[model samples]
Target: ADLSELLKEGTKEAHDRAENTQFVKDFLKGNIKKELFKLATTALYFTYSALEEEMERNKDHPAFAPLYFPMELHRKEALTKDMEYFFGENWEEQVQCPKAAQKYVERIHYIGQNEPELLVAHAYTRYMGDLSGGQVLKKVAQRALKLPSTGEGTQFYLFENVDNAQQFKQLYRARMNALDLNMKTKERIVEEANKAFEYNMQIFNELDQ
Candidate 1:
């Protein structure tokens, strides 16, 4: 089977589990408080900072090169701006990574430095989800917090480089499908993707508490 199809099936259960998490459920129900919403944003900033950094380091590697559309997919810069908007100019001094988020960062670094090919799994889980569910979350959080229509606090979800997210996602899947990988390698990538979902859920559960 194709890599994209394999991942779609492999991570489907975890994906549903992720949606059921308290943090996600509460947020979707428009129950997220501003403080909780900002904390969620901060968690993403920490997570994406590491994911994009490692992606930058491996941009030339064959396993990841085809998927490297940094301008369209990268969130670290926008997350930084969101941080500034939420925490003010002194955001760097005020923000801190939570334990579960730190664990996610460590896994990304481990994959980037050691299992470089599996980097696709992390990128796939993150960017795909962002392009899909992220739009709804952005609007929900924006209206829930009464954030300006000018896009201040929810900048992390906006992709300025890609005009059509639906088209871009199909292109991304094609890029992933085009990567030259064997069945064994593809299976490993699927496994890593499931792990990626678990890491995301762990962060959500932690934040929920």
Candidate 2:
């Protein structure tokens, strides 16, 4: 619980600063929308790849049972809803952008065909961390509430009442810990989680630019 609290507090502070900054406001309103859309689409595709890989790997690992890979498959509906809310009529166009969409599809196919299970597991676990991290960020966003209701943005931060995010994160951690992974493998998993965060930060930085 202390780790969870620390994660929440750190994310809250970071989100507050980023969301309130003039740079964030300006970027969201400006040309960075294209980049943001691309980043989101790319992330979604990578997540798909990761989940598929994990599921496949689970089949071969007799010592480790398969995980549900929460947020990878279940959250697509939420993602679509958020896209519709944020982009309105142009949501499809944004998702289908020629350059981004093509690249994402290619990557998805490559990951799927060769080492599907590993890729999927990596992506699934990484996305779990992301979803857990976002819960804290959303609280910060709600505090700002600077934009209009219509143009404000999608309520992607608003988890449904049934979602016990803290407990979910704890479950995720416990599951990871339970896996019959060597210390190096466990450390790699954590490193992947950190990479997931860094990748997200890169997206934000690109949008800000």
Assess every candidate by TM-score. 0.98, 0.54
| Residue-pair clashes per candidate | 0, 9
Query: Cα lDDT for residue 28, model 1?
Result: 86
lDDT assessment of candidate 2:
0.46
**For model 1, how does the per-residue alpha-carbon lDDT over 51-111 read when each residue is reduced to its tens digit?**
9999999999988998888889999999999999999999989878988999999999999
Per-residue lDDT over 1-209 for candidate 2, one digit per residue giving the tens place of the 0 to 100 score: 23223334434544454456554564445433444544554455444444454444454544334455534334455555656655675676665423433444354445445533333234444445556666454444434444354423434444454267767656765654455555554444444334434444444454444
lDDT of each candidate versus the true structure: 0.91, 0.46
Question: Where does model 2 exceed 4 Å of error?
Answer: 1-65, 69-73, 95-136, 139-155, 161-163
lDDT (Cα) of model 1:
0.91
Residue pairs that clash (backbone atoms under 3 angstroms), model 1 = none
